[PDB]
């Protein structure tokens, strides 16, 4: 009875094109906020943030007022899209192919004319994703909202603190906060200023998954490259191991290229770490070729230089704690014995070249072990958020 | 005749904006339920559940009533979207880019004013997918439904048990149940409580496919890594086999990373199993380098330590059940025979180092076989649903 | 003139909400059929069938009738969506994100009131895809159509044989038939039965492409694994070949996993075939390790057991048709000659162990060749449609 | 003034449901054509053609006529969708999920009632893509247009030559032509014929990119397989090279499978070329195993058959232009010299087996070089468009 | 009060179909411009540019004028889509499946009748992407805008300089400029000219990411191929290293094929660079086979040709700075000594062939190092933008 009479009365002469102010010279105050339900996806490669959000817009409609004593039991009415005036607030940095992603719900109006409007949506927003410290990164994504066609002389947009009480945590991103800021900017289109409300989502990447799939495996595979310096040269498998480990490390290189955006702003931390590991494994292969040159050195070729025999066989080795008929028969027997003596001298020269290969192999093991530790620790601990990451995620 | 007259009469003054209650102070009772037709997809990486569902909403429209004696043969009428008042029930945790995925069908009304509305849809809902026990996991996905703009003072939302009579089984997921719960929550937006109806789909993953593509292949490939400890050192192929098996096991590592969500909540069971298998294969390569160091040990270098010759060549070996002219001619002939004697001593020292490599190789085979069995069985049987999985799926 | 007058007359008091029957107590007869133009896609992994179809719905509108003598030259009229009553027939097992995929075209009405309505669409339907016999599989996909809101008391849905006269063959699927069945089911929603018309598309997979990309390559690569048993042990490349062939066969394993649905209903035929080939190649590697143990057997170690020397060197080999100063000088010369004699005995023992490796290698070649043929032929010919496939596709 | 009066007058009693003919018995003539702007994509795997096209439809509206002298300055008017009668022309073989992809623009009408309507769109059409001669293929894709609900008794559809003056060339496809054909077909739905206009896009694939990424790399990698026949057997790397080259050639095999449709109509040219190259590389590995059997042949085993020593060591080799105390001391010295003589005989038998391996290796190099050239040239030049391709693209 | 009266007055007799000119014979002037907010994506493979743009259209509506003194405080009004006449300006080279991607916002009108309309959108436009100099490329993408149905006699389209003041830089593309050009073209459809406004986005690719993921890794891996010429032949690992490096370089080849469009207009710079590196690595493998032929040369076979012993062992080597009872006993002892002498001659011939392999190996190292440097530097510096790229990006 009374609900049916109130709806009929309220729409008499109501024009949804009219900004509902009693005084046309005064701007209308609109309070804007949001509730963050969930961070659905962070697309680093496309530089897009997907969120599940409830916008909250409240204002006063001067015309949608009634005396509740004359309509007993009718405290609120509801209006769908296009039947009541609404603010045209949009996300400026929308990345959605439709631009506007809001699902239009009802406007709730109470007897004094206060209007609530809480449309939900899955919002896709353009966000600069800084991968300088990936995977120990903190991202600051901005959601910029404003009335598209109403400047500050017509619509006084005010801000209210974002709601996070219903937020559902993402397994990958720790929410730090969503502070808001209300600004008033001039655009070359228009002489009137246009206020906006910008919410910045400060989120922190949880690093367990990337430690498991990116960091740890690289550490262990680099460790196996160091085994080349232990494999005896006579196994004939030194090169196989080294080059095979290097060719497997490109799998992680190509993995990183697929996830990171193709930007030139900085070299990502993970890229530095992987590039430095692969360069150390590449240099180990170079060193292995030199070690094989000494082990297979032709005895009848050159002679161990003086500097080789002192630097390696003396200094480095110490430091490493390594350390008539009867006359014819005589002529033939003496030839056979001298041939053996000559072979003994040649094999003693070969043994000296093989010792040099072992020493260089032993010196390189230690040197390359030190380079790996320093590079690994130095690169990883340069990240401002590394200590916090290991504390919370491991 | 009568159908045409009833439709004309029913819409006289009908306002689709009006909640159809006789008494405006009383809330309207709405019964909500669903029929689950099919679980279409579970996206673990995006944390989304796709379902084919028929929502069921029933209420009473006070105005859509008629005397069937005055309209003989007209027991029901039908109204499309926007011509009859409807409840604005939505899925709160929708992940669909349009948010609302319901296909709007007719409302069926009978002569006493009871309204049925059974809109179908393909629903995408945000679901926390716990991969702690993957692939022996049980997921609990929630579908939360509620009126968006009508609080409990206007719309009394009641629940009815979900229908599963037309459910078509998914080859990958066994449906355990879909219990519902009716709650009444307060939101900071509004002083009025808002009831919701939450259906939790309890589903169990069928594990045959993952046993075939993930578990079994890992077991067999780990088994082939143990063959290194049987390959004679003189084949010159020990390292090739080991490192090749390790480099193939990253294929499964990268396979798992592609399917699992990048979350830091827990280390998945499958990750533990694969990480522990690869670490055992990596340690086997380390042990192989030590075995090759003993087999290729230079006889003129150090001497088998005392502890090496007792621990290995005695204890472990037992346990493993392994076990003037004529004078010149004399001088030259004696040199040739002593050179042979010296070679015999050196090769007997080399044979002793080769036996040590064999023993260490034999001890490591047994030890690594035991580590594989224990790790494999221990990790797999820690899953609460492992026994049930093998009973039903294998 | 007359076309303009007929349209004006026909819509006078026409209500598109009214089921167009003269007698409101009688159900309306609707004839339903379809024309299958093309099978666009079969998504085995998502279990979805995409088709290009023209629905055909015909009924009688009691009100859309006229005397053609009073409107000379006007034999038919046309009405778009929402201006004429239409049946609300939907595909029940739609997999489309919009659910309803029909493109709404005109309804054609002739002077006696017979209405034709032939809306086209690209339909996505949920279909159980049985991969038990893949790639020699026959699929039966169901298209279930019915009025959503009109039960059998209001709408008498009848079936007509599907049209295939304009069907364009798919290169991958041979159409067997599209029989239809008209049923009448009860639903817990409603006390009234709801008739449906189900068209089952029986399609047969053409197997040339999969024979070329899956079967043939597996056969040939398995054949190359058998070459290990021919490679002399002294080449030092037996393990490289075997393990390399095994590591390449996982490419096909991972290929199959990507195309097949992750279901636990059955082990696909192709999975059996590939799993059995890889297991045979894996066992060949195991056998190769045993062959290398005999070839590299230390002569001073154990002695060929009695059972080894009879089973292999005798039986299997036959079957395989394999088959004072002068005294000191004497003491030194005799030592040199006895050392040679001892070496000859040791190398004759080594030659006997190498012959055993060759025999075991020759016995294993034949045995593994037989296992490959039996497994390959036995698995492939277990498929009920294998004979037909080779007849028609190869 | 006059524009405002003309629009008001023109819509008085205008019914957009009415086919705008003065005489209702006569069909309306509609001229149909298109402008091809760009070939956007050819999806061979999904068998879909995407084009950017401007449809052109012109007819006469009997009612939209005016005297320009009474409306000075008003030569044309414009009407949007749904306000003026339009032809319902659709693409029959649309592959778009929405079916109709036309963006509805204005209809332009001039004072004599001639109507122009030029709606643009991105059209996706089902096209049989014949991959028999890929990548030297010429495709003929059909765009079939017709009125959906107006047969030839109501709508006389006529054709006009397609416009290509604004066509932008695709880097991958050379446009040969777009001839049109106007037909009149009967459908089982309807006793009336329905005319259609079919435009066939004849396009030719430009082959530089595929020559660079598919053909050339296969040629060079096959060439490297022939190097096995030059590698000395004593390098111990013959098998590594051959099997490694074969395992890399599956990369191109799997590349081709990903781009080609999974059809059984024919074996694509590129598949023949790659399959024949891999089979030649596979046979080279088989031949390498036989060459290693001769090189490692045990001297104490069988004896070079008579046919082996003539066919290879004589004929093929020529063609290839290859080519008391003192008595005891005597007994021991004579044993040492006879042992050397026996070793010399055995190594001379081994040298003869090694020469056979070299000859077979040299004969196989030439034979396999000839098979590669013949197969490569023979397969590639069987394509009717190969000569034109190399002329225009290389 | 006054806002409500103005809206009611303004729509009295307003026809949105009417071009709002006072004089129907005169064309309406429309000013068109845009603001470029962000370059979202450049799809080289699909040849599509995605941008976030605000179109700016301004004109004068003769009818939407009022005296502000009679409506105090009402300086502007707003109208949504379909209520006010608007220009139908579209992007001609749209690649969006919907064609028109504009999100329709309000039109702002002030008291003198000046209309502003600034609709935003995510625009996808077809763009020829020239990959001749990739990754040192500069792209010129065109955005062509024009009224679809209003020719130059009705709509006088004028241009204004594009706004870039709010442009947000892309990490991958440096914006050079967005100049505009206003043209007037004739189309075969129509005798009237149709003006357009074309904005050309000149953008430059930032090359740090591609230098890191494409160029640098290729340089280093090619460098490791040169190590083969240092590995002693007796290591038995020369072929493994070379062929393994070649088989890894196809990873980058296949990477490039995936990103580049499949066009035949030119061979991309990156393709030249990678193809030339792989050909040099392939030739190194060929040279390695020749080096192994000399190292393993049978001493009893042919004799080092005269030209081989001078060109290599003399010239190249210098340049490279390489450098009764007693009678029987005599007969047997002399046989043993002559056999040793003969072996010494054979091994001295073998040492001469091994020296030739070393020299050829040393000459090839230098030659191949020079080819790598020349090819690398020559190809990279042929790009007109290479110098600028290294200056700004590295
Ligand atoms: C830093 C990276 C490595 C940098 C440089 C290379 C270092 C290794 C080679 C040199 C080792 C020393 C040696 O023994 O050289 C040999 C000569 O060597 C030469 O004369 C040429 C060496 C340069 C090779 C160029 C390719 C390097 C590949 C780069 C790979 C990139 C790796 C990237 C990894 C991320 C020794 O010959 P010799 O002793 O002169 O001859 C004795 C003559 N006699 C018989 C008359 C007495
Ligand atoms: N995708 S691409 O950048 O155009 C590209 C990159 C590298 C590359 C090609 C294409 C092919 C085109 C010509 C050589 C051929 C290939 C190759 C294969 C084997 C050997 Br041995 C040598 C060279 N090298
Ligand atoms: Ca799943
Ligand atoms: Ca193509």
PDB file of C-alpha atoms in Angstrom, chain A residues 15-18 81-82 85 88 149-150, chain E residues 7 11 14 16 59 64 77-86 104-109 116-117:
ATOM      1  CA  UNK A  15      14.823  13.900 -14.055  1.00  0.00           C
ATOM      2  CA  UNK A  16      17.830  11.516 -13.830  1.00  0.00           C
ATOM      3  CA  UNK A  17      19.859  14.068 -15.835  1.00  0.00           C
ATOM      4  CA  UNK A  18      19.689  16.595 -12.968  1.00  0.00           C
ATOM      5  CA  UNK A  81      20.557   1.956 -13.124  1.00  0.00           C
ATOM      6  CA  UNK A  82      19.190   4.881 -15.125  1.00  0.00           C
ATOM      7  CA  UNK A  85      20.788  10.273 -10.780  1.00  0.00           C
ATOM      8  CA  UNK A  88      29.793   8.921 -12.966  1.00  0.00           C
ATOM      9  CA  UNK A 149      32.304  14.781 -16.525  1.00  0.00           C
ATOM     10  CA  UNK A 150      31.712  16.689 -13.234  1.00  0.00           C
TER      11      UNK A 150
ATOM     12  CA  UNK E   7      16.625  20.271 -18.939  1.00  0.00           C
ATOM     13  CA  UNK E  11      14.680  18.639 -24.993  1.00  0.00           C
ATOM     14  CA  UNK E  14      15.166  18.059 -29.904  1.00  0.00           C
ATOM     15  CA  UNK E  16      19.126  13.427 -31.919  1.00  0.00           C
ATOM     16  CA  UNK E  59      31.546  21.183 -31.741  1.00  0.00           C
ATOM     17  CA  UNK E  64      21.539  23.598 -26.800  1.00  0.00           C
ATOM     18  CA  UNK E  77      24.414  20.585 -18.667  1.00  0.00           C
ATOM     19  CA  UNK E  78      25.278  16.970 -19.429  1.00  0.00           C
ATOM     20  CA  UNK E  79      23.732  14.427 -21.773  1.00  0.00           C
ATOM     21  CA  UNK E  80      24.352  10.662 -22.081  1.00  0.00           C
ATOM     22  CA  UNK E  81      24.546   8.471 -25.181  1.00  0.00           C
ATOM     23  CA  UNK E  82      21.575   8.699 -27.538  1.00  0.00           C
ATOM     24  CA  UNK E  83      19.949  11.823 -26.061  1.00  0.00           C
ATOM     25  CA  UNK E  84      22.107  14.417 -27.843  1.00  0.00           C
ATOM     26  CA  UNK E  85      23.416  14.383 -31.385  1.00  0.00           C
ATOM     27  CA  UNK E  86      27.013  13.185 -31.525  1.00  0.00           C
ATOM     28  CA  UNK E 104      30.545   6.246 -24.088  1.00  0.00           C
ATOM     29  CA  UNK E 105      30.601   9.071 -21.521  1.00  0.00           C
ATOM     30  CA  UNK E 106      28.576  12.262 -21.147  1.00  0.00           C
ATOM     31  CA  UNK E 107      28.612  15.235 -23.499  1.00  0.00           C
ATOM     32  CA  UNK E 108      29.234  18.513 -21.659  1.00  0.00           C
ATOM     33  CA  UNK E 109      27.409  21.550 -23.076  1.00  0.00           C
ATOM     34  CA  UNK E 116      32.747  18.782 -25.304  1.00  0.00           C
ATOM     35  CA  UNK E 117      32.920  15.005 -25.526  1.00  0.00           C
TER      36      UNK E 117
END
